[PDB]
Amino acid sequence: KEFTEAVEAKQVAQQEAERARFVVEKAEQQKKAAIISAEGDSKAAELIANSLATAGDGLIELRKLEAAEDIAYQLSRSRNITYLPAGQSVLLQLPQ
Amino acid sequence: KEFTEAVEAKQVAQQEAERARFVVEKAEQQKKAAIISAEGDSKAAELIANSLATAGDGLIELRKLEAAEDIAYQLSRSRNITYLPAGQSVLLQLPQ
Amino acid sequence: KEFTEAVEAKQVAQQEAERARFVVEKAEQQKKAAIISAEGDSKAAELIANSLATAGDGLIELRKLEAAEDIAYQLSRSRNITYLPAGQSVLLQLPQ
Amino acid sequence: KEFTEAVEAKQVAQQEAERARFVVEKAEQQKKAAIISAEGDSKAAELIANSLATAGDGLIELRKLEAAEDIAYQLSRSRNITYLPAGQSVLLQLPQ
Amino acid sequence: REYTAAVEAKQVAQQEAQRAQFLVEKAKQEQRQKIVQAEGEAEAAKMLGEALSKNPGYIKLRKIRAAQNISKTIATSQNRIYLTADNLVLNLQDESFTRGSDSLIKGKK
Amino acid sequence: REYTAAVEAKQVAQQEAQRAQFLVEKAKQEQRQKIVQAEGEAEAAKMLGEALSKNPGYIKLRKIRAAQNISKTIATSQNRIYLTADNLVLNLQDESFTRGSDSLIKGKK
Amino acid sequence: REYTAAVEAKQVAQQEAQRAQFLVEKAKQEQRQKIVQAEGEAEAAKMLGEALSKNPGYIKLRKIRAAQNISKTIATSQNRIYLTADNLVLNLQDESFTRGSDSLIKGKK
């Protein structure tokens, strides 16, 4: 069963090797696309970085406060979310 | 049969491409109008920020009170309420 | 019964020995090929290591933040997973 | 019952003495065979140590990590696994 | 199956590399769309820094209001988050009462 | 069973050593493809490193927005958890209330 | 039982000890086979050691990205785990927040 399968694998692998030279080309193009989309996200991010670096940590904390509303909004669609103060000696003991 | 379905999926991708053209335009528009809708809510923020950088937290003292009445009615629904320490070496066991 | 079994094992051992000498040669080719799939991965890794060594820890932490979203995405397709502070005297418990 | 059994054990134990002579002739050979399969494993290993010494902890780490995909593929057939931070006063508990 | 698939995929790959440059354009557009989502976020950012890096006043007050809003939606939150003893000081009689309420003192804040 | 199997394995292993150098080539092409996948991951890596390793401005705000994308994903998260209390600084009436986020004065952060 | 068993064992063992030096040979070929499977692994290892031993750039980012891969797998995971919550550092109002990802400044990571 491995003889015909090996021959077809060699043929399909030559087809896929040429198709995959062109798929490495496609991958350069698709990476232009994915880079630029993940960088939709992340260039929004870098302009946020510039805003917070020039202006200071204003919305560093205030999306750490506005989006901190997300904590109370969204923590316990489950049932066991919580926290524990620091600068201290907490006896952490997760719930059951 | 599956060939028609694959062609249909390809056409769906092309229609997403058209929708993304009109998302290009929508993106121009919310460039302008999301920058400046920010500007609005955010300048409520500008002046509260300056007012408080000068003096300190004025409005959620009075609105610990007012928003206590209202949205801490929306917290008198909050079943489990306790009230944190800090400035010491606080150490904790908590609800299961 | 061990007589015929062991004689058959002797003949099988001859064929498997010569077979496996050439399986080791074919495995020189296949070790190159498996180094090559692991190269897909690991050479993405070479370029990532170069990228991060040259450009600091941006996505060291931002796959620890962006793809740390994966942590919430996945940790809980079972119901007993968690993430919990330290820098304290944390005296960890884990649940039933 | 132990008279006939004792005589049989007597004769069979002398026979097993001679059978021992040649069972560990066979087991000179079988020590070699098991040695050598475990040596396939362990010389993959000799040259793995060679590769990761001439190169370093790259995949000493990443067949922890790429193979930690396997950690998670294999652990979860069970339902009580854990991994819990150090640098604490962990009194680690266990589930039920 | 993979042979015809591979050849058709190579031809479709030429036409789809053309359409992949088209995708680069479309994804620069999505670039702008998410640029702008988080750049409304970033307008908030630039101004909140300019108004708070001076001294975090709305950030003091918005730790307070985000603690209040975090409480406020902790209401609907089943979360077994808590607080603990002695800051909102409801040791209503205490020095800590004048170290949580007089903690409002600047320098202590 | 294993005798003819091993002989045919030797012959097909000649064929498959040829096809295994051919696998070197084909899996090299899939290697470049997978390189390129995890290297779009890596271009995220580069981009973010150059952008935010000099000073994590948006990596600060992404600690933030990705702790909140994590906790926009904590819905799936049955996960019992623990943040820290002086993180949400629900220490409203406290000395360390705005030790947490008068760290907006850079240097504490 | 053990008498004829032992006699046949000794004869079958003469020819099986011939067969078992022959097993030294056979298992040696299997030895090299397993060697070369885990050598695909091993030279991936050499290459990754040149990739990473120089600097844990992708060792850092892969602590983290394997964290995320292991995690995409921890879907199936029941494993009851921990963090140190200052690892994602979700410290959403805190000084230790920008100690977690001011580790972006290489040296603390």
Side-chain angles (χ1 to χ4, degrees):
Chain A
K1 173 158 173 178
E2 293 202 30
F3 168 57
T4 303
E5 286 181 353
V7 173
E8 187 181 31
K10 168 181 80 188
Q11 301 276 358
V12 160
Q14 211 163 17
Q15 298 314 306
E16 278 197 356
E18 287 179 0
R19 160 204 182 269
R21 294 171 194 173
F22 211 90
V23 174
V24 173
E25 299 296 328
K26 286 169 70 75
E28 289 162 349
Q29 304 303 338
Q30 178 260 318
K31 287 296 131 173
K32 279 151 214 191
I35 291 159
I36 203 79
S37 171
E39 283 171 355
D41 174 64
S42 193
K43 209 63 44 184
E46 280 99 8
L47 61 83
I48 295 155
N50 163 42
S51 54
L52 305 153
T54 64
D57 295 1
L59 190 80
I60 282 174
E61 190 65 41
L62 295 175
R63 267 308 181 293
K64 213 195 305 183
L65 296 169
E66 285 152 297
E69 299 174 332
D70 311 339
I71 282 184
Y73 289 140
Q74 207 271 353
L75 277 195
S76 54
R77 298 159 172 180
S78 158
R79 314 167 287 96
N80 310 316
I81 297 88
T82 177
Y83 57 79
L84 293 169
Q88 296 170 356
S89 294
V90 175
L91 62 82
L92 189 160
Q93 163 177 102
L94 68 81
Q96 292 73 238
Chain B
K1 163 191 157 191
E2 295 179 353
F3 165 78
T4 307
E5 294 205 331
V7 173
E8 197 152 313
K10 157 180 79 174
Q11 299 293 356
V12 167
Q14 200 169 339
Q15 304 318 321
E16 289 181 90
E18 295 304 325
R19 170 262 183 197
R21 185 157 294 165
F22 315 116
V23 179
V24 186
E25 276 97 16
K26 183 266 288 178
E28 321 290 326
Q29 290 99 31
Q30 59 74 49
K31 306 296 294 287
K32 295 184 282 289
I35 297 169
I36 301 172
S37 181
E39 279 296 344
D41 168 2
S42 186
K43 177 158 181 71
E46 293 180 353
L47 188 139
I48 185 65
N50 292 292
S51 163
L52 301 172
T54 58
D57 304 335
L59 191 55
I60 296 89
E61 296 296 329
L62 173 56
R63 282 183 75 176
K64 273 175 215 72
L65 279 296
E66 305 172 0
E69 306 147 358
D70 294 332
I71 299 89
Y73 154 65
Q74 193 272 328
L75 294 186
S76 189
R77 188 175 185 270
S78 84
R79 202 172 312 291
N80 289 298
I81 293 168
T82 58
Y83 298 130
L84 281 178
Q88 296 168 355
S89 68
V90 179
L91 181 157
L92 304 172
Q93 182 178 2
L94 73 165
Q96 306 213 344
Chain C
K1 56 95 181 182
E2 182 59 288
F3 169 50
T4 309
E5 289 186 353
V7 178
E8 180 187 31
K10 189 165 70 189
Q11 308 293 354
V12 162
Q14 192 172 1
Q15 303 323 300
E16 197 280 333
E18 286 190 1
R19 165 210 200 266
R21 305 209 57 94
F22 209 100
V23 173
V24 175
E25 169 45 35
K26 170 211 78 170
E28 274 184 349
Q29 298 310 331
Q30 183 272 330
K31 66 182 290 294
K32 183 68 175 175
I35 299 151
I36 278 159
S37 187
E39 264 169 359
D41 193 73
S42 171
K43 195 175 226 166
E46 269 95 355
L47 54 89
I48 296 153
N50 165 43
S51 171
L52 305 154
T54 55
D57 295 3
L59 195 72
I60 295 169
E61 183 71 30
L62 281 194
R63 281 289 170 280
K64 213 199 296 180
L65 295 174
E66 296 156 317
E69 301 160 350
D70 308 335
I71 292 156
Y73 277 113
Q74 66 83 11
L75 279 183
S76 58
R77 281 140 199 194
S78 177
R79 321 166 295 93
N80 305 273
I81 297 89
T82 178
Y83 64 72
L84 312 182
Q88 295 152 2
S89 285
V90 159
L91 59 92
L92 171 151
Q93 164 158 356
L94 65 87
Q96 283 79 64
Chain D
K1 170 160 175 178
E2 291 181 353
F3 160 61
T4 305
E5 278 200 354
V7 177
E8 191 177 32
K10 169 194 84 178
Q11 308 274 359
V12 165
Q14 199 166 20
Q15 295 320 307
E16 282 182 353
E18 282 204 2
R19 189 201 174 267
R21 301 295 68 167
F22 207 88
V23 165
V24 181
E25 280 293 329
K26 168 185 167 70
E28 287 160 355
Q29 319 320 335
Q30 192 269 318
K31 67 166 270 280
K32 291 160 206 190
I35 282 161
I36 291 159
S37 173
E39 270 171 2
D41 203 356
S42 185
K43 192 275 188 170
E46 277 101 5
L47 62 84
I48 278 166
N50 183 355
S51 54
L52 296 152
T54 64
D57 204 308
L59 184 63
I60 288 175
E61 174 59 14
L62 289 195
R63 269 311 181 286
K64 322 177 179 169
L65 285 193
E66 304 153 303
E69 304 149 354
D70 313 328
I71 287 166
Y73 293 138
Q74 76 189 267
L75 276 184
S76 72
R77 67 185 184 273
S78 161
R79 289 202 313 98
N80 299 259
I81 305 100
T82 193
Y83 60 88
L84 307 184
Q88 300 166 321
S89 289
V90 175
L91 75 166
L92 179 146
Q93 312 303 348
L94 61 83
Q96 274 74 15
Chain E
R1 174 178 171 177
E2 283 194 33
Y3 193 101
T4 306
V7 177
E8 180 187 57
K10 199 170 80 185
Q11 204 281 325
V12 168
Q14 189 71 53
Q15 74 93 34
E16 182 62 24
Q18 278 137 15
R19 190 258 183 188
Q21 293 148 27
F22 175 83
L23 271 177
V24 166
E25 295 194 291
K26 174 198 182 180
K28 263 177 176 153
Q29 308 302 353
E30 205 287 329
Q31 168 66 261
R32 299 159 100 259
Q33 199 282 328
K34 203 171 284 181
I35 276 170
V36 293
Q37 186 274 327
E39 183 274 326
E41 298 270 327
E43 189 288 320
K46 64 97 182 173
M47 60 77 70
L48 285 169
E50 61 80 20
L52 297 165
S53 69
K54 304 169 173 171
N55 165 9
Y58 178 83
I59 293 167
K60 277 176 187 72
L61 174 145
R62 190 55 204 264
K63 306 151 63 45
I64 302 175
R65 189 156 276 162
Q68 292 322 119
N69 297 329
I70 279 163
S71 198
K72 279 159 196 166
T73 76
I74 289 156
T76 72
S77 189
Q78 190 283 342
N79 63 14
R80 282 137 165 155
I81 80 163
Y82 49 74
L83 313 170
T84 293
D86 80 16
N87 265 277
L88 312 163
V89 178
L90 289 155
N91 317 106
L92 190 61
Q93 303 176 358
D94 198 354
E95 293 83 4
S96 183
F97 193 64
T98 54
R99 316 167 195 153
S101 303
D102 283 327
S103 84
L104 278 287
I105 290 282
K106 56 168 169 294
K108 291 175 71 175
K109 297 281 195 180
Chain F
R1 184 169 175 171
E2 290 182 37
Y3 187 108
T4 306
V7 173
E8 181 187 60
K10 195 172 79 188
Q11 209 276 329
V12 173
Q14 181 63 65
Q15 203 283 329
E16 176 56 33
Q18 271 148 15
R19 193 255 170 187
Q21 179 40 45
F22 200 57
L23 273 174
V24 172
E25 301 309 328
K26 182 270 289 175
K28 257 175 169 155
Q29 296 298 109
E30 297 180 346
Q31 160 195 353
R32 283 154 89 229
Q33 188 274 331
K34 191 190 291 181
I35 277 161
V36 173
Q37 188 274 331
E39 176 268 338
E41 280 273 297
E43 203 286 337
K46 161 197 152 191
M47 174 269 293
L48 287 168
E50 279 98 7
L52 304 157
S53 291
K54 67 183 178 66
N55 167 37
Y58 183 87
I59 283 181
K60 274 170 192 85
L61 188 134
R62 194 50 180 264
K63 295 191 83 85
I64 304 162
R65 185 163 310 131
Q68 303 325 116
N69 291 324
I70 288 156
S71 74
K72 281 154 215 172
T73 311
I74 286 171
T76 61
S77 184
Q78 202 281 349
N79 297 115
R80 325 175 157 91
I81 69 163
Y82 294 120
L83 321 167
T84 289
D86 61 32
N87 297 359
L88 306 176
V89 189
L90 301 172
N91 297 115
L92 169 45
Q93 276 182 18
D94 198 15
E95 285 73 22
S96 81
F97 182 62
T98 62
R99 295 181 208 146
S101 290
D102 288 351
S103 74
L104 279 293
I105 305 289
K106 57 183 73 64
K108 267 191 204 182
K109 264 194 250 183
Chain G
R1 182 172 175 173
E2 290 188 34
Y3 208 104
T4 306
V7 175
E8 183 179 61
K10 201 165 86 183
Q11 201 283 324
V12 176
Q14 186 54 61
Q15 63 84 30
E16 167 67 39
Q18 272 138 19
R19 182 259 169 175
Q21 311 149 28
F22 207 63
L23 274 172
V24 180
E25 297 194 289
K26 173 203 189 288
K28 265 180 170 161
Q29 320 316 338
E30 270 188 347
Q31 191 254 338
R32 294 158 81 242
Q33 169 265 356
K34 211 179 281 179
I35 280 158
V36 190
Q37 287 165 317
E39 200 287 345
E41 295 281 301
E43 173 153 341
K46 173 178 73 178
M47 180 181 69
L48 267 174
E50 292 99 9
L52 295 159
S53 86
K54 307 157 170 266
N55 180 355
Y58 178 90
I59 274 168
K60 280 168 188 78
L61 178 139
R62 190 55 192 286
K63 286 151 41 56
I64 298 150
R65 170 167 295 156
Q68 310 329 314
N69 297 334
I70 302 161
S71 71
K72 294 145 206 174
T73 309
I74 284 170
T76 188
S77 160
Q78 191 286 338
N79 62 43
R80 316 190 163 89
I81 80 174
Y82 265 56
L83 269 180
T84 289
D86 80 3
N87 292 355
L88 299 171
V89 182
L90 316 165
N91 301 52
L92 212 60
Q93 319 180 4
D94 210 2
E95 319 100 337
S96 77
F97 204 60
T98 73
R99 308 175 195 139
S101 308
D102 291 351
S103 85
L104 275 293
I105 298 93
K106 60 181 74 65
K108 178 175 184 299
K109 275 300 298 168

